[PDB]
Design a protein around this ligand. Structure first.
Ligand SMILES: [Zn+2]
Length: 161
């Protein structure tokens, strides 16, 4: 009776920060660090409403992030909650919800489909030019349109996204 639910989905700490009513699983790891009132009452209520169920990842799932992470460089430079949520969803091959700069990247290189929020920029810029040699990014054409880092020519590129 009346058991509407989405497909598999895992929710991050940040989802309980913004006020995003959604369903799925939550990490008993991250909730230990959730000290606010909004992000408590909301999380606990959705839990008790059976919108979200408790699940922490397998070790191999954590180690999965470590593999691709040590290949991209920042291996443990990411927070534990971050790794924990992401890992779990990769074991389920389901879905994720978050809106962090690293969280977005990791799910990207891991190939896992996720949702994120209506922000757009909070410090970053657009850009539109690329060196051909050292592959340096530019937002403008340098003098001669040549690379102040390798001397090679610079050319235009497609959209950021
Ligand atoms: Zn260059």
């Amino acid at each position: 009776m009346l058991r509407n639910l989405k497909k598999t989905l895992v929710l991050d700490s940040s989802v309980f920060i913004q006020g995003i009513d959604i369903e799925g699983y939550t990490t008993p790891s991250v909730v230990e660090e959730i000290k606010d009132r909004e992000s408590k009452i909301f999380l606990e209520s959705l839990i008790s409403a059976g919108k979200v169920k408790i699940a922490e990842p397998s070790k191999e799932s954590i180690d999965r992030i470590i593999q691709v992470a040590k290949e991209t460089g920042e291996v443990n430079e990411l927070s534990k909650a971050d790794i924990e949520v992401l890992a779990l969803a990769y074991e389920l091959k389901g879905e994720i919800f978050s809106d962090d700069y690293n969280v977005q990247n990791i799910a990207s290189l891991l190939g896992l489909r996720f949702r994120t929020l209506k922000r757009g920029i909070k410090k970053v810029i657009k850009w539109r030019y690329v060196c051909i040699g050292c592959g340096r990014k530019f937002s403008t054409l340098p003098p001669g349109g040549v690379c102040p880092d390798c001397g090679s020519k610079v050319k235009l590129i497609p959209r950021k996204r």
